[PDB]
Short mmCIF file of C-alpha atoms in Angstrom, two decimals:
data_model
loop_
_atom_site.label_atom_id
_atom_site.label_comp_id
_atom_site.label_asym_id
_atom_site.label_seq_id
_atom_site.Cartn_x
_atom_site.Cartn_y
_atom_site.Cartn_z
CA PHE D 1 -132.66 234.60 -80.11
CA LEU D 2 -135.81 236.56 -79.30
CA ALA D 3 -134.03 239.88 -79.78
CA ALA D 4 -132.41 238.80 -83.07
CA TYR D 5 -135.68 237.85 -84.73
CA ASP D 6 -137.85 240.61 -83.32
CA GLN D 7 -139.38 242.28 -86.36
CA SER D 8 -136.98 240.53 -88.75
CA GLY D 9 -139.60 238.71 -90.81
CA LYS D 10 -137.44 235.58 -90.82
CA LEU D 11 -138.98 232.84 -88.63
CA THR D 12 -140.36 229.54 -89.84
CA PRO D 13 -144.19 229.50 -89.58
CA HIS D 14 -144.53 226.92 -86.80
CA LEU D 15 -142.47 229.09 -84.48
CA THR D 16 -144.19 232.25 -85.66
CA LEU D 17 -147.51 230.98 -84.29
CA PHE D 18 -146.04 229.68 -81.04
CA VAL D 19 -144.30 232.95 -80.19
CA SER D 20 -147.25 235.12 -81.23
CA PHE D 21 -149.45 233.05 -78.90
CA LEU D 22 -147.03 233.55 -76.01
CA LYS D 23 -147.07 237.30 -76.58
CA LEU D 24 -150.89 237.41 -76.53
CA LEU D 25 -150.87 235.68 -73.12
CA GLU D 26 -149.13 238.65 -71.47
CA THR D 27 -152.53 240.31 -71.05
CA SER D 28 -153.67 237.32 -69.01
CA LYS D 29 -150.68 237.65 -66.71
CA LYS D 30 -151.64 241.28 -66.06
CA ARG D 31 -155.19 240.38 -65.01
CA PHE D 32 -154.21 237.25 -63.07
CA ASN D 33 -151.66 239.00 -60.88
CA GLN D 34 -154.24 241.49 -59.56
CA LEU D 35 -155.89 238.75 -57.51
CA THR D 36 -153.72 239.42 -54.45
CA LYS D 37 -155.04 242.98 -54.19
CA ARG D 38 -158.66 241.95 -54.72
CA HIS D 39 -158.26 239.36 -51.97
CA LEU D 40 -156.85 241.86 -49.46
CA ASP D 41 -159.50 244.52 -50.17
CA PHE D 42 -162.28 241.95 -49.81
CA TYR D 43 -161.10 240.89 -46.37
CA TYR D 44 -160.69 244.40 -44.95
CA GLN D 45 -163.82 245.92 -46.52
CA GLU D 46 -166.41 243.15 -46.79
CA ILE D 47 -165.44 240.75 -44.00
CA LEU D 48 -164.22 243.23 -41.40
CA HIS D 49 -166.47 246.11 -42.63
CA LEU D 50 -163.78 248.79 -42.33
CA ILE Q 1 -188.37 215.30 -60.16
CA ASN Q 2 -189.48 216.91 -63.38
CA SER Q 3 -185.87 217.18 -64.64
CA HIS Q 4 -185.86 213.48 -65.58
CA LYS Q 5 -186.82 212.67 -69.18
CA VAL Q 6 -188.18 209.65 -71.09
CA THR Q 7 -186.00 207.59 -73.54
CA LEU Q 8 -187.55 205.62 -76.45
CA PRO Q 9 -186.68 203.21 -79.33
CA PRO Q 10 -186.76 205.13 -82.70
CA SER Q 11 -189.43 203.12 -84.65
CA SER Q 12 -192.46 205.20 -83.62
CA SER Q 13 -190.86 208.42 -84.80
CA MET Q 14 -189.98 206.86 -88.08
CA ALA Q 15 -193.60 205.91 -88.74
CA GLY Q 16 -194.42 209.61 -88.23
CA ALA Q 17 -191.63 210.68 -90.59
CA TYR Q 18 -192.82 208.25 -93.27
CA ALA Q 19 -196.25 209.91 -93.22
CA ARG Q 20 -194.74 213.36 -93.76
CA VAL Q 21 -192.68 212.31 -96.74
CA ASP Q 22 -195.59 210.47 -98.39
CA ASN Q 23 -197.71 213.64 -98.20
CA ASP Q 24 -195.01 216.15 -99.22
CA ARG Q 25 -193.40 214.28 -102.11
CA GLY Q 26 -194.85 210.78 -102.56
CA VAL Q 27 -194.14 207.12 -101.70
CA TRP Q 28 -191.22 207.02 -104.15
CA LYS Q 29 -189.24 209.65 -102.18
CA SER Q 30 -186.56 208.43 -99.77
CA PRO Q 31 -187.22 208.95 -95.96
CA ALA Q 32 -183.60 210.00 -95.29
CA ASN Q 33 -182.33 213.53 -94.46
CA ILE Q 34 -185.47 214.37 -92.49
CA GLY Q 35 -185.36 215.93 -89.02
CA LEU Q 36 -187.14 214.54 -85.96
CA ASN Q 37 -189.39 216.45 -83.57
CA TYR Q 38 -189.17 216.23 -79.77
CA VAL Q 39 -185.66 214.78 -79.82
CA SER Q 40 -182.88 216.26 -77.75
CA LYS Q 41 -180.25 213.84 -78.90
CA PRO Q 42 -179.37 210.23 -79.90
CA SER Q 43 -178.61 208.06 -76.85
CA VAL Q 44 -175.07 207.33 -78.13
CA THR Q 45 -172.68 208.89 -80.63
CA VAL Q 46 -171.69 206.74 -83.60
CA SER Q 47 -168.29 207.46 -85.22
CA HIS Q 48 -167.48 207.25 -88.93
CA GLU Q 49 -165.47 204.09 -88.43
CA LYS G 1 -141.52 236.76 -108.63
CA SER G 2 -144.19 238.51 -110.68
CA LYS G 3 -146.99 236.28 -109.29
CA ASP G 4 -146.53 237.27 -105.62
CA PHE G 5 -150.13 238.41 -105.00
CA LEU G 6 -151.49 234.90 -105.02
CA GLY G 7 -149.48 234.40 -101.86
CA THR G 8 -147.97 231.59 -99.73
CA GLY G 9 -149.44 229.60 -96.78
CA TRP G 10 -149.89 226.34 -94.85
CA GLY G 11 -150.81 223.16 -96.73
CA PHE G 12 -154.34 222.03 -95.86
CA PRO G 13 -153.70 218.65 -94.42
CA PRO G 14 -150.62 220.08 -92.69
CA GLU G 15 -147.68 217.76 -92.79
CA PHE G 16 -144.73 218.01 -90.48
CA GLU G 17 -141.28 216.96 -91.57
CA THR G 18 -138.47 215.61 -89.39
CA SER G 19 -135.55 216.04 -91.84
CA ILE G 20 -135.94 219.71 -91.02
CA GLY G 21 -138.20 221.05 -88.28
CA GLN G 22 -140.79 222.59 -90.60
CA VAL G 23 -144.42 222.39 -91.70
CA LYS G 24 -145.01 222.20 -95.44
CA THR G 25 -146.37 225.21 -97.30
CA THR G 26 -148.08 225.87 -100.65
CA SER G 27 -148.05 228.77 -103.13
CA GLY G 28 -149.67 230.22 -106.22
CA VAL G 29 -151.90 227.80 -108.11
CA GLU G 30 -151.28 224.94 -105.66
CA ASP G 31 -152.52 227.17 -102.87
CA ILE G 32 -155.68 228.00 -104.86
CA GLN G 33 -156.50 224.35 -105.46
CA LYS G 34 -156.27 223.57 -101.73
CA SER G 35 -158.45 226.57 -100.87
CA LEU G 36 -161.22 225.08 -103.00
CA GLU G 37 -160.86 221.69 -101.28
CA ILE G 38 -161.28 223.40 -97.87
CA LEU G 39 -164.30 225.52 -98.82
CA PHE G 40 -166.37 222.67 -100.17
CA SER G 41 -165.45 220.40 -97.25
CA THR G 42 -167.01 222.53 -94.54
CA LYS G 43 -170.53 223.40 -93.43
CA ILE G 44 -171.95 226.91 -93.03
CA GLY G 45 -172.03 227.10 -89.23
CA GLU G 46 -168.79 225.23 -88.39
CA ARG G 47 -166.39 228.19 -87.99
CA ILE G 48 -166.60 230.05 -84.66
CA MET G 49 -166.66 233.75 -85.47
CA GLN G 50 -167.29 233.14 -89.19
CA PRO G 51 -170.93 231.89 -89.07
CA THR G 52 -171.37 232.08 -92.85
CA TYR G 53 -168.48 230.11 -94.39
CA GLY G 54 -168.75 226.90 -96.36
CA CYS G 55 -171.47 225.39 -98.49
CA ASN G 56 -174.87 223.67 -98.51
CA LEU G 57 -174.32 220.87 -101.04
CA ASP G 58 -175.55 218.26 -98.47
CA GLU G 59 -179.14 219.56 -98.92
CA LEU G 60 -179.34 217.55 -102.12
CA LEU G 61 -178.52 214.13 -100.68
CA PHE G 62 -181.23 211.47 -101.11
CA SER G 63 -183.00 213.32 -103.92
CA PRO G 64 -183.75 212.50 -107.60
CA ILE G 65 -181.71 214.13 -110.36
CA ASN G 66 -183.46 216.55 -112.74
CA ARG G 67 -183.22 220.00 -114.38
CA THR G 68 -184.39 221.92 -111.30
CA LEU G 69 -181.74 220.29 -109.13
CA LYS G 70 -178.97 220.97 -111.61
CA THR G 71 -179.90 224.66 -111.72
CA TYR G 72 -179.86 224.85 -107.92
CA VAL G 73 -176.45 223.08 -107.67
CA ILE G 74 -174.88 225.57 -110.03
CA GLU G 75 -176.22 228.52 -108.04
CA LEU G 76 -174.84 227.12 -104.76
CA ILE G 77 -171.35 226.63 -106.20
CA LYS G 78 -171.14 230.03 -107.87
CA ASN G 79 -172.20 231.94 -104.78
CA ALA G 80 -169.73 230.13 -102.52
CA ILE G 81 -166.91 231.10 -104.87
CA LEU G 82 -168.01 234.75 -105.21
CA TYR G 83 -168.07 235.17 -101.45
CA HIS G 84 -165.02 233.16 -100.44
CA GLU G 85 -162.37 232.73 -103.24
CA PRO G 86 -161.23 236.10 -104.79
CA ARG G 87 -158.48 234.68 -106.97
CA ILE G 88 -160.60 232.78 -109.57
CA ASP G 89 -163.36 233.03 -112.19
CA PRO G 90 -165.49 229.88 -112.81
CA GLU G 91 -165.57 228.78 -116.43
CA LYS G 92 -167.90 225.80 -116.61
CA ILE G 93 -169.89 223.51 -114.31
CA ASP G 94 -170.69 220.09 -115.79
CA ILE G 95 -173.22 217.95 -113.80
CA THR G 96 -173.79 214.30 -114.84
CA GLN G 97 -174.93 210.86 -113.57
CA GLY G 98 -172.49 208.02 -114.26
CA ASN G 99 -174.39 205.18 -112.55
CA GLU G 100 -177.84 203.71 -113.27
CA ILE G 101 -177.95 202.04 -109.83
CA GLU G 102 -175.27 203.45 -107.51
CA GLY G 103 -176.37 206.71 -105.92
CA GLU G 104 -173.72 208.86 -107.58
CA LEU G 105 -173.78 212.41 -108.91
CA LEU G 106 -170.66 213.65 -110.69
CA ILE G 107 -169.79 217.36 -110.70
CA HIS G 108 -166.86 218.76 -112.69
CA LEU G 109 -165.81 222.38 -112.02
CA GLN G 110 -163.49 224.16 -114.45
CA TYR G 111 -162.03 227.58 -113.65
CA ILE G 112 -159.56 230.32 -114.67
CA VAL G 113 -156.92 231.94 -112.43
CA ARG G 114 -157.01 235.77 -112.45
CA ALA G 115 -154.07 237.80 -113.86
CA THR G 116 -154.99 240.98 -111.89
CA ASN G 117 -155.34 241.42 -108.10
CA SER G 118 -158.83 241.40 -106.53
CA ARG G 119 -159.97 243.95 -103.92
CA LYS G 120 -160.90 241.10 -101.57
CA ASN G 121 -157.53 239.28 -101.61
CA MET G 122 -155.80 239.55 -98.22
CA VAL G 123 -152.15 238.98 -99.23
CA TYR G 124 -149.74 240.94 -97.01
CA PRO G 125 -147.76 243.44 -99.15
CA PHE G 126 -150.82 244.23 -101.32
CA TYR G 127 -154.06 244.57 -99.35
CA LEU G 128 -152.56 247.45 -97.35
CA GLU G 129 -152.91 249.82 -100.25
CA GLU G 130 -155.20 247.81 -102.63
CA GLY G 131 -157.81 246.06 -100.40
CA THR G 132 -160.72 248.51 -100.52
CA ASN G 133 -163.56 246.06 -99.93
CA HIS S 1 -162.86 220.37 -80.37
CA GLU S 2 -163.11 223.78 -82.01
CA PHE S 3 -161.91 222.64 -85.43
CA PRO S 4 -163.99 221.24 -88.33
CA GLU S 5 -164.52 217.59 -89.16
CA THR S 6 -162.43 218.06 -92.30
CA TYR S 7 -159.30 218.43 -90.12
CA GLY S 8 -159.94 214.92 -88.65
CA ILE S 9 -159.05 215.71 -85.01
CA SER S 10 -162.61 215.40 -83.60
CA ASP S 11 -164.48 212.57 -81.82
CA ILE S 12 -166.13 211.12 -84.90
CA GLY S 13 -162.80 210.51 -86.59
CA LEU S 14 -162.16 210.53 -90.31
CA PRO S 15 -163.86 208.23 -92.96
CA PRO S 16 -161.76 205.13 -93.97
CA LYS S 17 -162.07 205.83 -97.68
CA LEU S 18 -159.69 208.78 -97.34
CA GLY S 19 -156.74 206.46 -96.72
CA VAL S 20 -154.04 205.91 -94.14
CA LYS S 21 -151.86 208.83 -95.05
CA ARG S 22 -154.55 211.32 -94.17
CA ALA S 23 -155.22 209.53 -90.87
CA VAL S 24 -151.50 209.74 -90.05
CA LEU S 25 -151.37 213.44 -90.76
CA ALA S 26 -154.27 213.96 -88.37
CA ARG S 27 -152.17 212.30 -85.66
CA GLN S 28 -149.32 214.72 -86.40
CA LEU S 29 -151.60 217.71 -85.95
CA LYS S 30 -152.91 216.46 -82.59
CA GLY S 31 -149.32 216.29 -81.40
CA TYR S 32 -148.62 219.86 -82.46
CA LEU S 33 -151.75 221.29 -80.88
CA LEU S 34 -150.92 219.75 -77.44
CA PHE S 35 -148.21 222.40 -77.05
CA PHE S 36 -150.97 225.01 -76.82
CA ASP S 37 -153.33 223.00 -74.68
CA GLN S 38 -150.88 222.05 -72.00
CA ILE S 39 -150.18 225.73 -71.32
CA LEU S 40 -153.81 226.76 -71.19
CA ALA S 41 -154.62 223.85 -68.90
CA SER S 42 -151.94 225.09 -66.48
CA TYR S 43 -153.53 228.50 -66.13
CA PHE S 44 -156.94 227.03 -65.33
CA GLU S 45 -155.32 224.70 -62.84
CA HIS S 46 -153.61 227.60 -61.14
CA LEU S 47 -157.00 229.24 -60.39
CA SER S 48 -158.10 226.09 -58.57
CA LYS S 49 -155.22 226.47 -56.13
CA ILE S 50 -155.68 230.07 -54.97
CA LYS S 51 -157.34 228.85 -51.79
CA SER S 52 -154.33 226.75 -50.91
CA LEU S 53 -151.72 229.30 -51.78
CA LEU S 54 -153.17 231.82 -49.34
CA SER S 55 -154.39 229.34 -46.65
CA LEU S 56 -154.05 230.12 -42.95
CA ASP S 57 -154.08 226.44 -42.04
CA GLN S 58 -151.52 225.02 -44.44
CA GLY S 59 -150.12 226.03 -47.81
CA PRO S 60 -149.06 223.73 -50.69
CA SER S 61 -145.55 222.48 -51.47
CA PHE S 62 -145.61 223.69 -55.09
CA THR S 63 -146.30 227.11 -56.51
CA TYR S 64 -146.86 226.15 -60.17
CA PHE S 65 -149.34 223.51 -61.33
CA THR S 66 -150.46 221.42 -64.36
CA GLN S 67 -153.21 218.97 -65.48
CA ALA S 68 -153.59 215.79 -67.44
CA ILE S 69 -155.66 216.35 -70.56
CA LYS S 70 -158.12 213.51 -71.10
CA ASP S 71 -160.78 214.74 -73.56
CA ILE S 72 -158.53 213.81 -76.47
CA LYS S 73 -159.16 210.30 -77.74
CA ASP S 74 -155.63 209.04 -78.20
CA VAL S 75 -153.58 210.64 -75.42
CA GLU S 76 -152.58 207.14 -74.37
CA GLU S 77 -150.64 206.83 -77.61
CA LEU S 78 -149.45 210.43 -78.00
CA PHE S 79 -147.51 210.33 -74.69
CA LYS S 80 -144.35 208.22 -74.26
CA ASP S 81 -145.38 207.24 -70.73
CA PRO S 82 -149.15 207.29 -70.00
CA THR S 83 -148.42 206.73 -66.31
CA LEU S 84 -148.15 210.46 -65.75
CA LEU S 85 -151.69 211.06 -66.93
CA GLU S 86 -152.95 209.17 -63.90
CA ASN S 87 -151.50 211.63 -61.36
CA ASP S 88 -151.26 215.41 -61.78
CA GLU S 89 -148.63 215.65 -59.03
CA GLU S 90 -146.20 213.44 -60.97
CA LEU S 91 -147.04 215.25 -64.14
CA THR S 92 -146.17 218.55 -62.43
CA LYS S 93 -142.80 217.30 -61.25
CA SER S 94 -142.01 215.97 -64.74
CA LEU S 95 -143.18 218.96 -66.84
CA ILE S 96 -142.40 221.99 -64.68
CA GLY S 97 -139.90 220.49 -62.31
CA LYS S 98 -137.07 222.71 -61.24
CA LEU S 99 -138.51 225.81 -62.88
CA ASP S 100 -140.61 226.07 -59.68
CA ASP S 101 -138.29 227.73 -57.14
CA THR S 102 -140.47 226.71 -54.22
CA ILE S 103 -138.34 227.88 -51.31
CA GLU S 104 -138.13 231.48 -52.40
CA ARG S 105 -141.71 231.67 -53.62
CA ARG S 106 -143.17 230.03 -50.51
CA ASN S 107 -141.35 232.51 -48.30
CA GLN S 108 -142.72 235.47 -50.23
CA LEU S 109 -146.29 234.24 -49.76
CA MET S 110 -145.82 233.61 -46.06
CA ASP S 111 -144.23 236.97 -45.45
CA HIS S 112 -147.14 238.73 -47.09
CA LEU S 113 -149.70 236.94 -44.95
CA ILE S 114 -147.70 237.64 -41.78
CA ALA S 115 -147.38 241.31 -42.71
CA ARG S 116 -151.18 241.60 -42.86
CA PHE S 117 -151.20 241.29 -39.06
CA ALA S 118 -148.29 243.74 -38.75
CA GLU S 119 -145.87 241.04 -37.55
CA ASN S 120 -142.27 240.31 -38.72
CA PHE S 121 -140.08 237.14 -38.84
CA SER S 122 -136.92 238.60 -40.43
CA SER S 123 -134.61 237.54 -37.59
CA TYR S 124 -135.15 233.82 -38.28
CA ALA S 125 -133.06 234.30 -41.37
CA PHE S 126 -129.90 234.32 -39.33
CA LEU S 127 -130.72 233.24 -35.80
CA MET S 128 -131.56 229.77 -36.99
CA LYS S 129 -128.09 229.41 -38.49
CA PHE S 130 -126.61 229.02 -35.08
CA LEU S 131 -128.73 225.95 -34.59
CA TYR S 132 -129.04 224.32 -37.98
CA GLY S 133 -127.24 224.30 -41.30
CA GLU S 134 -128.91 223.91 -44.69
CA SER S 135 -131.98 222.36 -43.01
CA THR S 136 -133.13 225.80 -41.76
CA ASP S 137 -135.13 226.50 -44.92
CA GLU S 138 -137.62 223.74 -44.16
CA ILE S 139 -137.72 224.50 -40.46
CA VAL S 140 -138.39 228.18 -40.92
CA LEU S 141 -141.30 227.67 -43.32
CA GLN S 142 -142.90 225.24 -40.88
CA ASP S 143 -142.60 227.74 -38.03
CA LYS S 144 -144.13 230.57 -40.06
CA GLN S 145 -147.20 228.47 -40.88
CA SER S 146 -147.64 227.54 -37.22
CA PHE S 147 -147.48 231.19 -36.23
CA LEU S 148 -150.37 232.12 -38.50
CA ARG S 149 -152.55 229.24 -37.22
CA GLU S 150 -152.01 230.18 -33.58
CA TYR S 151 -152.33 233.94 -34.11
CA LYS S 152 -155.82 234.51 -32.65
CA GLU S 153 -154.67 233.71 -29.11
CA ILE S 154 -151.10 235.02 -29.52
CA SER S 155 -152.14 238.60 -30.21
CA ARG S 156 -154.89 238.68 -27.61
CA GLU S 157 -153.80 237.03 -24.41
CA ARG S 158 -150.77 239.19 -23.84
CA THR T 1 -185.06 244.84 -52.73
CA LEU T 2 -187.29 244.52 -55.74
CA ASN T 3 -186.47 242.89 -59.02
CA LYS T 4 -185.03 245.12 -61.73
CA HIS T 5 -185.30 244.84 -65.49
CA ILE T 6 -182.28 243.10 -67.07
CA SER T 7 -180.50 244.14 -70.27
CA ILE T 8 -177.17 243.83 -72.08
CA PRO T 9 -174.81 246.70 -73.06
CA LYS T 10 -174.28 247.45 -76.75
CA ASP T 11 -170.71 248.87 -76.75
CA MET T 12 -168.75 245.62 -77.01
CA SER T 13 -165.29 247.16 -77.08
CA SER T 14 -162.63 247.04 -74.39
CA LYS T 15 -159.26 246.62 -76.10
CA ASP T 16 -158.26 243.86 -73.64
CA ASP T 17 -158.33 240.07 -73.30
CA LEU T 18 -162.14 239.88 -73.38
CA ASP T 19 -162.34 241.60 -76.79
CA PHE T 20 -162.18 238.98 -79.57
CA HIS T 21 -161.69 241.36 -82.46
CA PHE T 22 -158.95 243.23 -80.68
CA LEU T 23 -157.04 240.02 -80.01
CA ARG T 24 -157.39 238.88 -83.60
CA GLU T 25 -155.90 242.11 -84.98
CA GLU T 26 -152.95 241.98 -82.60
CA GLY T 27 -152.34 238.38 -83.60
CA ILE T 28 -152.02 239.29 -87.25
CA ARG T 29 -149.79 242.28 -86.52
CA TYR T 30 -147.36 240.04 -84.65
CA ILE T 31 -147.37 237.49 -87.48
CA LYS T 32 -146.36 240.06 -90.08
CA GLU T 33 -143.58 241.45 -87.94
CA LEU T 34 -142.05 238.04 -87.30
CA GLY T 35 -142.73 235.89 -90.38
CA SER T 36 -143.89 237.89 -93.46
CA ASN T 37 -140.90 236.61 -95.46
CA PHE T 38 -142.49 233.19 -95.64
CA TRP T 39 -146.13 233.50 -94.61
CA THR T 40 -148.01 236.14 -96.62
CA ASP T 41 -151.43 234.60 -97.35
CA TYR T 42 -153.78 235.73 -94.57
CA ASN T 43 -157.05 234.69 -96.18
CA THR T 44 -159.73 232.84 -94.24
CA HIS T 45 -159.16 229.43 -95.84
CA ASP T 46 -155.65 229.33 -94.34
CA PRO T 47 -155.09 226.74 -91.54
CA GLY T 48 -152.73 229.21 -89.89
CA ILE T 49 -155.38 231.88 -89.50
CA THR T 50 -157.93 229.24 -88.44
CA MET T 51 -155.69 228.22 -85.53
CA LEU T 52 -155.24 231.85 -84.46
CA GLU T 53 -158.98 232.43 -84.21
CA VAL T 54 -159.44 229.29 -82.09
CA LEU T 55 -156.77 230.42 -79.67
CA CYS T 56 -158.26 233.92 -79.38
CA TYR T 57 -161.58 232.36 -78.41
CA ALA T 58 -159.87 230.24 -75.73
CA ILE T 59 -158.18 233.33 -74.27
CA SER T 60 -161.51 235.11 -73.80
CA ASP T 61 -162.77 232.10 -71.82
CA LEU T 62 -159.81 232.26 -69.47
CA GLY T 63 -160.21 235.99 -68.89
CA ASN T 64 -163.88 235.55 -68.11
CA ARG T 65 -163.19 233.12 -65.26
CA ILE T 66 -160.49 235.26 -63.75
CA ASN T 67 -163.18 237.93 -63.24
CA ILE T 68 -165.40 235.64 -61.10
CA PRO T 69 -165.88 237.36 -57.70
CA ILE T 70 -163.77 236.32 -54.71
CA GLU T 71 -166.78 235.12 -52.75
CA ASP T 72 -167.01 232.19 -55.14
CA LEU T 73 -163.38 231.63 -56.08
CA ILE T 74 -162.32 230.88 -52.53
CA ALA T 75 -165.51 229.21 -51.33
CA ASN T 76 -165.44 225.94 -49.42
CA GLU T 77 -167.49 222.93 -50.42
CA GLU T 78 -169.35 223.13 -47.11
CA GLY T 79 -169.59 226.92 -47.04
CA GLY T 80 -167.84 229.23 -44.59
CA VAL T 81 -164.37 230.80 -44.55
CA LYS T 82 -162.69 228.74 -41.82
CA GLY T 83 -159.23 228.45 -43.38
CA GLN T 84 -159.24 231.80 -45.15
CA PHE T 85 -160.20 234.52 -42.74
CA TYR T 86 -160.56 235.29 -39.10
CA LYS T 87 -163.97 236.83 -38.34
CA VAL T 88 -164.65 240.07 -36.42
CA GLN T 89 -166.00 238.14 -33.42
CA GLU T 90 -162.62 236.47 -33.19
CA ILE T 91 -160.01 238.98 -34.33
CA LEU T 92 -161.26 242.40 -33.09
CA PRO T 93 -162.15 241.90 -29.32
CA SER T 94 -159.51 242.44 -26.64
CA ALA T 95 -158.82 240.85 -23.25
CA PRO T 96 -159.96 243.19 -20.48
CA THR T 97 -157.05 245.25 -19.01
CA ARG H 1 -132.95 253.88 -28.73
CA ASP H 2 -134.65 256.62 -30.76
CA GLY H 3 -138.21 255.26 -30.77
CA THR H 4 -139.90 255.82 -34.11
CA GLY H 5 -141.34 258.45 -36.40
CA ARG H 6 -143.15 259.31 -39.61
CA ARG H 7 -140.46 258.25 -42.09
CA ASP H 8 -140.15 254.80 -40.48
CA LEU H 9 -143.79 253.79 -40.90
CA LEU H 10 -143.66 252.10 -44.34
CA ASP H 11 -144.05 248.31 -44.36
CA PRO H 12 -142.18 247.06 -47.46
CA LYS H 13 -144.09 243.77 -47.62
CA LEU H 14 -147.70 244.85 -47.07
CA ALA H 15 -148.45 246.26 -50.51
CA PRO H 16 -150.08 243.51 -52.66
CA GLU H 17 -147.60 244.16 -55.51
CA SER H 18 -144.82 242.40 -53.59
CA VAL H 19 -146.40 239.09 -54.68
CA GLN H 20 -146.45 238.12 -58.33
CA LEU H 21 -148.56 234.97 -58.52
CA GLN H 22 -147.37 234.28 -62.08
CA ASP H 23 -143.82 235.25 -63.18
CA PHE H 24 -143.01 233.37 -66.40
CA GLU H 25 -141.46 235.24 -69.34
CA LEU H 26 -141.34 234.23 -73.02
CA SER H 27 -138.01 232.55 -72.33
CA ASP H 28 -139.49 230.33 -69.65
CA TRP H 29 -142.26 229.03 -71.83
CA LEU H 30 -139.67 228.31 -74.49
CA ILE H 31 -137.66 226.20 -71.98
CA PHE H 32 -140.91 224.41 -71.13
CA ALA H 33 -141.36 223.58 -74.83
CA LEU H 34 -137.77 222.29 -75.22
CA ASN H 35 -138.40 219.73 -72.48
CA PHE H 36 -141.95 218.85 -73.54
CA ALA H 37 -140.81 218.07 -77.10
#
């Protein structure tokens, strides 16, 4: 479905908003998933002072 | 201690507001749609219903 | 399909149907009439990143009716339209009092829909090459 | 709470003189907008659990989370069963449910924490199958958590 | 260890989730690509566009909390790091051999 | 046994990347909506 309507111009407006919202959220996923690295660096550099 | 504020009935502020309106426009001008000084908020929120 | 620069959009009080999974839309003149209902139903600071959108008609509540007021009302209405509704030209504003006792003021706005496309009208296949300002 | 009063979905309601039909339409809009709020609420909820997900004492049973939304005046009528709004754990099981593949995700978190001490539990993957059947998945996760808790002495008093 | 003067930067542009105007433009681009056959009016009185702007604002709020430093995000109510980290006094020393 | 050496020193599960705290795609949020409705 998602492939078929990508850049077709053919979705009903209530789905157009919902999908466009879900696409905007991908930038939040990118920031959120960097927490595991920030956590590790904090422990080795600020707690253990290495 | 100083973070705690005083709460009052509205009548004394209205007497003040009446004086302003009487001087700015006259006794025949309605007191409504006039702002109050030294008020953070109404104690409760009243809905349209 | 000549009048495609007035555009198509969501109805203001959006209604959802169940006979088909869709939200109702408006177009052309119907769309213009709902735009006017929205503009004069909202206050200047109510939109989040649009701090100057709406009108100040509430300033005149609890006031007597005279010539100075009527002049001021007309100015408020005309400026709100010039800033926020590119598709119309006001024709006449008629301000009258229909009640000796009840606190009522009656305002009748008449307007004309434009036959040519404005430079401020953000309708998709047009503003791209015609929306200069 | 970010919309204007004209829309009718705010705390002060909508004036009676505008009629029932407009009040009904406001109800329809609240329903629609909950599809956007339930997702955002999940992401905020997920931040609150970072401490648990990476805990050395004991991790959580779930890896995805949700919240009841209660700053909307009629949620008791919008939802078919208001019971769920009284307990976020039940709400999670009902709304996310199976989509949360807890066994695989919990193992990935544990393996990362164990790796930080340069240790390795790979052999449990098959050695435990000579002792237990399907029940090994629960047993193995319990043992990995115990190992991290006891690590201070284990690596020192050799 | 003295107090410094405090000010705010003037180049409010990042092209990421903390940039309101950036998000708004991307929103509209996606709308045209997916639904321009039916939804063409993108003027400011449109309920559709109004909803988009509200959501963009909400996204910025989320991004701003994600950037809160670790020292606060994993803090305990009583202070300390008991269940999060082992301290140097505990994890670096070795038995004497 | 052959001991160890330079090419054997990479721990595949130490790099923070190995953990994706959030993995939903567009298709998973759509399944969420189908249920929620």
